Each structure stands twice: as structure tokens, then as C-alpha cells.
């Protein structure tokens, strides 16, 4: 193959496609997802003992 230099047209086709369906997916604004993450983390911050230490025999990792 010398008309497409080892069929580099397949990778161009796939690049064009993946760009197309990257354009297809919706754009959700940065602050929206940021606030979503704050809400989730601060909701689950009473169940992460890394943030809130738990007694030595009330967890199996100070055992």
C-alpha cells in the first residue's frame, strides 16, 4: 500500500468518529459537576474514617 502509506486512513476514520461522538455527548458545565462532587463528598464525610478517626477496636485496621 503506497496510496495511503500503510492504510493510515483507518486511524483517521476512527479519529474522526471518536471526535464526532465526543461532540455528540452533552457538555455539563464545570461548576455543576464541581458542586455535585462537593455534595457527594460532604454527604459521605461522616462515613470516611480517614476524615473521622474511629476507636482502635471499633475498626479492624487498628487491630
Amino acid at each position: 500500500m503506497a496510496s495511503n502509506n500503510t492504510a493510515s486512513i483507518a486511524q483517521a476514520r476512527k479519529l474522526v468518529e471518536q471526535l464526532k461522538m465526543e461532540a455528540n455527548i452533552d457538555r455539563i458545565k464545570v461548576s455543576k459537576a464541581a458542586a455535585d462532587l462537593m455534595a457527594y463528598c460532604e454527604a459521605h464525610a461522616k462515613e470516611d474514617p480517614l476524615l473521622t478517626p474511629v476507636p482502635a477496636s471499633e475498626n479492624p485496621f487498628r487491630e
Binding site: S3, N4, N5, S8, I9, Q11, A12, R13, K14, L15, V16, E17, Q18, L19, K20, M21, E22, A23, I25, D26, R27, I28, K29, V30, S31, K32, A33, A34, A35, D36, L37, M38, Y40, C41, E42, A43, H44, A45, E47, D48, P49, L50, L51, V54, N59, P60, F61, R62, E63
Partner: protein, 339 residues
């Protein structure tokens, strides 16, 4: 030839894609906000020193029970530790050294291994006797395995070299869904909790997120210029951390299709080597090639602390599935359970 329209057609698309993200771009409310609760200093001690390796551990990966972690040495041994009683549940020597993936199945019944052997071994921990017996040796990888992850106990995605991360049906030993498009070899293989999409880093600094059964490149995030080492999803699976050989980490969002916000300091110059998200996801815990790992407040971009104590680089990091303890795949032949 036709490349003339192809090279054009990509450009404009790439252009608008960038513009789309610039269209989607807002001020990052997280870093803008400082009224969110601080996480304070975290100089937490390690409670277990799982010594018992004679070679540098490359990768360690927790099990679903958050008690058994598989640790792969550089010399070729898998130690399925017991974090509570520091007892070796099993030691699996391998046919080939230089293993860097330790895939614990989401059952405690299978383990997958691989490295420069170019062959992904699948070991059935449970057998008739009760001792380790190799279930399969998945061949068909041209390049070296980088990371392996079970979806089923008969289906496994196996990120490898040769710009592939194809998925194998375990029993037939056949690649089922092939993924191509990377220019650099794949290193990372991060599975979202949904297990229907997986994002993979590579040596081309482009985190390509693929739909697992379709074989199509859902997204191609890029914020790095250096090879991506490890990717750890949020317990939401909506955004993932991304570390490379640089002095910064990044947080990429699927919905925004662009970097949410980056985790950088001139306080350290060494590359990221491992990333992890806790139960909440509030803490981004990053292993480092500097002889200690760091923990950042993921929603404030400032280093919450450093887990000092190691004298050799933390070659890998893994947080428990309960999200309240973390283990280091340090190069000092010791895994330290930080809690």
C-alpha cells in the same frame, strides 16, 4: 490522497471539540469555594508493616473484602496477605519475573497476573484440594501486560502494550473486544463502579475512556504531556484522577469532557505513580516516586498531608473498598497499612 480530507476533517473536529470544552468551561466552583469543610492535617500512623517480600513490590491491589490484598513483587511472587493477622494466605510464584499487575477478582476466588511475560495468567484460588491451581494462561497479547481487571470471573479486560487493552473471555482464551487508537502503550486500566466503561492511560499522555462491550473510544481526555501511570475512578465513576511522570495530577470529568481541576505543587518535583479515591472521594491519595506518598484535599487542591516514613518510593497505592485504610506498594519490600 483521501488523507487530505481526513487530516482536514480531524482538525476542524478537534478544533470544535476544544471549543466545545471551552464552551463548557466555567470557573471551578470547588477551588473557588473555601467554605467547604477542611480535612485538616493527616499525619496518620501506619498500623501494619506487612514485611515478607524480598523484592520491590510493583503493584498492590485490595480485594473486595478489604482484608486480603494481593501484592506483586519484582521477582515474580504474589503474596495474598492478610492485613489483620499479617499472615500469607497464599504465595503464587510465576513462570516469569517482572509482574506488575495483581488483579484480584471481585469475589476472592480468582487472581490475575501479568508483566513482561506478555501472557496474562489467571489463577483459581479455590480448587478441589484447596491450594492454588492455575486456571488459564491467556495468550494473545503482543505487548507486555500493564494492568488487568476482572469484570466477570470468566471475562477480563487486560490492558497491555502494543497499543491494545482488549478484553478476553477466560475459558476460550480469545480476545473478545479489541481496543485500538493509542499511540503509546497502555499503562492504566481504571474501572468505574458501573463496570460498563473503562478509562486507560498510556505513554501518549491521552486518557482514552472506552465503552467495554462496544470497542469504541467514548472519550479521549488530554491534559498531560507525559506517560500516564495510574488512574483511579471516583466511587461515583463520573470523574477520575490522572497521574503522570510530572509534578502534577489532574481530575478529568466524563460529563464535562474536560479537566475539572488539577492537583499541582512546586513543593514536589517527582512523578505521580499511583492515585486513589477514598469512600467519600474527598481525599485524593497519591503515591509518589519521592520516598513518601501524599494525600491532597481533592476539593481544595492543597496537600492535606504526607504519609512520611518510607525510605524507598511508593511504587503503588491502594485504598480499601470500605474507603478507610490504604496500603503502599513501596520499594522497601514493605507494605504499610496507613490507618
Amino acid at each position: 490522497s483521501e488523507l487530505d480530507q481526513l487530516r482536514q476533517e480531524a482538525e476542524q473536529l478537534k478544533n470544535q471539540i476544544r471549543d466545545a470544552r471551552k464552551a463548557c468551561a466555567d470557573a471551578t466552583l470547588s477551588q473557588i469555594t473555601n467554605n467547604i469543610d477542611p480535612v485538616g492535617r493527616i499525619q496518620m500512623r501506619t498500623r501494619r508493616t506487612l514485611r515478607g517480600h524480598l523484592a520491590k513490590i510493583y503493584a498492590m491491589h485490595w480485594g473486595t473484602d478489604s482484608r486480603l490484598l494481593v501484592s506483586a513483587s519484582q521477582d515474580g511472587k504474589l503474596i495474598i496477605w492478610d492485613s489483620y493477622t499479617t499472615n500469607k494466605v497464599h504465595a503464587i510464584p510465576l513462570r516469569s519475573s517482572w509482574v506488575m499487575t495483581c488483579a484480584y477478582a471481585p469475589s476472592g476466588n480468582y487472581v490475575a497476573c501479568g508483566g513482561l511475560d506478555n501472557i496474562c495468567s489467571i489463577y483459581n484460588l479455590k480448587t478441589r484440594e484447596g491450594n492454588v491451581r492455575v486456571s488459564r494462561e491467556l495468550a494473545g497479547h503482543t505487548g507486555y501486560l500493564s494492568c488487568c481487571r476482572f469484570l466477570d470471573d470468566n471475562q477480563i479486560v487486560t490492558s497491555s502494550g502494543d497499543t491494545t487493552c482488549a478484553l478476553w473471555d477466560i475459558e476460550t482464551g480469545q480476545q473478545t473486544t479489541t481496543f485500538t487508537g493509542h499511540t503509546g502503550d497502555v499503562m492504566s486500566l481504571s474501572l468505574a463502579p458501573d463496570t460498563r466503561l473503562f478509562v486507560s492511560g498510556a505513554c501518549d499522555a491521552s486518557a482514552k475512556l472506552w465503552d467495554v462491550r462496544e470497542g469504541m473510544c467514548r472519550q479521549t481526555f488530554t491534559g498531560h504531556e507525559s506517560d500516564i501511570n495510574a488512574i483511579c475512578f471516583f466511587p461515583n465513576g463520573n470523574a477520575f484522577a490522572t497521574g503522570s511522570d510530572d509534578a502534577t495530577c489532574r481530575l478529568f470529568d466524563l460529563r464535562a469532557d474536560q479537566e475539572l481541576m488539577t492537583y499541582s505543587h512546586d513543593n514536589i518535583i517527582c512523578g505521580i505513580t499511583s492515585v486513589s479515591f477514598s469512600k467519600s472521594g474527598r481525599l485524593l491519595l497519591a503515591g509518589y516516586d519521592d520516598f513518601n506518598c501524599n494525600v491532597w484535599d481533592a476539593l481544595k487542591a492543597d496537600r492535606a498531608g504526607v504519609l512520611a516514613g518510607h525510605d524507598n518510593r511508593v511504587s503503588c497505592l491502594g485504598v480499601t473498598d470500605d474507603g478507610m485504610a490504604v496500603a503502599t506498594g513501596s520499594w522497601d519490600s514493605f507494605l504499610k497499612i496507613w490507618n
